[PDB]
Amino acid sequence: NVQSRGLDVAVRNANDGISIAQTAEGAMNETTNILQRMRDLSLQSANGSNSKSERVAIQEEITALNDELNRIAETTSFGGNKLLNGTFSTKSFQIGADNGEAVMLTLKDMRSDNRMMGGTSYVAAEGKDKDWKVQAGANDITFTLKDIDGNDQTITVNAKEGDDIEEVATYINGQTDMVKASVNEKGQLQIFAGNNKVTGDVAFSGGLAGALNMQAGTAETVDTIDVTSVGGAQQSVAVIDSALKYVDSHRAELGAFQNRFNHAISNLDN
């Protein structure tokens, strides 16, 4: 009798955990839709036809949407229990007729300024005008970084001789998916290492990096996006991509949680 009743309560607790995971993921749905809209605006704002006035118009919508991301994070709640602001932390949902049978659920911060929603940024101090071409010998760039898993890597991109600065950026993008390279207005090769992809600071070597001193790494997030410049707009596309991967990663963790809890409900009923 005690076991059967505890199974009835266990099914109720499994359902409540499904409810919290459902509400949290539904709110994440609009975080993904807002982020995608911000990514399309950044792509449009990275153009050349745009003038300062246009880029200010886009940055107005990006600031409005970025405020909307923080409003979804702070306000989204389940009956007054805030979920997406980072205060939820980890809560154990007891699903079982006896003590000790609980499943930990973690809900992560979705504020635009979360470190996970961005990465690191390295800008070349040497601008390369339209006449610059990769030279023989000084065409190899090496990125010594660490993965999110923690294993070290030594990607090496041998840029093609005769490539201009923007073709070097697109070549680096094709060769590796760990970093995203672009060029700003002053012809400086920016490189973004998403925090979801790498940890620590990226190191640069080789002849090409000798000609493109890469300066230090500044932490970036969606909250600090500024598309009023060609460089800022380009690097905001990369930031939003790292944020989109972060939001989708948490949606998959909540999807596996709901699926597991549905299997738990069927087992408990039987």
Binding site: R12, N15, D16, S19, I20, Q22, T23, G26, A27, T76, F78, G79
Partner: protein, 53 residues
């Protein structure tokens, strides 16, 4: 958030008609079973009359 909040309110507050109708029929059958047993019990002391007392 409105739909997901309503569904949670459903699992907690709203009634399961399948389970409640079964619980109602079961309760009725025990109401009739107790009534029948009561009638059989009311004649228990009537046997004392057969003792010519």
């Amino acid at each position: 958030i409105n739909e997901n909040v309503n569904a949670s309110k459903s699992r907690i507050k709203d009634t399961d008609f399948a389970k409640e109708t079964t619980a109602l029929t079961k309760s009725q059958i025990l109401s009739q079973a107790s009534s029948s047993v009561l009638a059989q019990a009311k004649q228990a002391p009537n046997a004392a009359l057969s003792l010519l007392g």
